[PDB]
């Protein structure tokens with residue numbers, strides 16, 4: 001996602017974490033504001049453009065070698081690759097926070113987990129084709145862009161009504177309502193099925209496989225004749241909106257559950 005999506009995921013997670021988890025994270029981050037997670041949710045996307053952070057570019061995605069829209073699937077050993085991936089990064093940084101939460105690596109580990117659980121839920125961050133859709137040029141509201149970009153940025157910002165941290169907070173409030181009582185309230189009690197702090201790869205692969213299903217059902221189902229030729233800000237946006245909104249909600253809910261397990265200690 002772009003910055004709005006990551007901040008929204010982070011604000012949702014803040015609304016679901018336990019108090020002890022909030023304290024654990026505020027202490028690592030040195031921030032006890034009501035934006036503590038949202039304030040770091042974009043860091044990984046700045047870091048990756050620096051020499052020191054170049055290593056971490058592959059950690060934003062897992063290039064699933066499926067065949068969409070005909071067939072979708074993610075396989076860790078087939079798709080992660082030698083340079084690592086979102087799944088291998090969740091394992092590494094989760095294990096740093098479990099083993100060394102008071103050490104110097106904890107700060108970046110937590111900022112990576114906040115960001116990357118967001119990225120796992122962007123379907124085109126779970127797809128090899130055309131570098132996650134970066135190579136598919138499209139038109140969106142009269143502008144030339146690419147399919148990856150409209151899922152990261154154009155469509156979420158249209159739905160949220162802007163791009164800023166305050167707009168993200170409002171959007172997160174809307175999606176948090178949908179989880180607690182609204183649209184998602186009868187399905188969210190299944191969203192953490194299979195979660196296992198002792199198996200970060202298995203857990204994050206469930207999430208990535210869930211998001212990847214939408215590459216076939218939603219991202220690419222219209223077929224590339226349509227996608228290449230049609231302004232996607234109309235009916236394509238209309239069908240995409242419920243899907244990316246539910247995936248942003250899932251990302252925040254699952255991030256909170258994961259942070260609770262990372263911070264958890266038996267009383």
Ligand SMILES: O=c1ccn([C@@H]2O[C@H](CO)[C@@H](O)[C@H]2O)c(=O)[nH]1
Pocket residue numbers: 057060061063124125126127128130131132134148149
């Ligand atoms: O296979 C790829 C290649 C790139 N990206 C993402 O696409 C962004 C560029 O739009 C990059 O920063 C990167 O995180 C993916 O999700 N998958």
Ligand SMILES: *[C@@H]1O[C@H](CO)[C@@H](O)[C@H](O)[C@H]1NC(C)=O
Pocket residue numbers: 084088089092093105108
């Ligand atoms: C784990 O994270 C550290 C710090 O960012 C990095 O140096 C190391 O290469 C990572 N290891 C793996 C297996 O991804």
Ligand SMILES: *[C@@H]1O[C@H](CO)[C@@H](O)[C@H](O)[C@H]1NC(C)=O
Pocket residue numbers: 135136137224225226228
């Ligand atoms: C759509 O554009 C992509 C990327 O250039 C291309 O691979 C594909 O063949 C195009 N499909 C159609 C039917 O135009």
Ligand code: NA
Pocket residue numbers: 229230231
């Ligand atoms: Na056209």
Ligand SMILES: [Zn+2]
Pocket residue numbers: 001002006118119122152
């Ligand atoms: Zn992102």
Ligand SMILES: [Zn+2]
Pocket residue numbers: 001002122125148152
């Ligand atoms: Zn992206």
Ligand SMILES: [Zn+2]
Pocket residue numbers: 001044045060115119
């Ligand atoms: Zn990212």
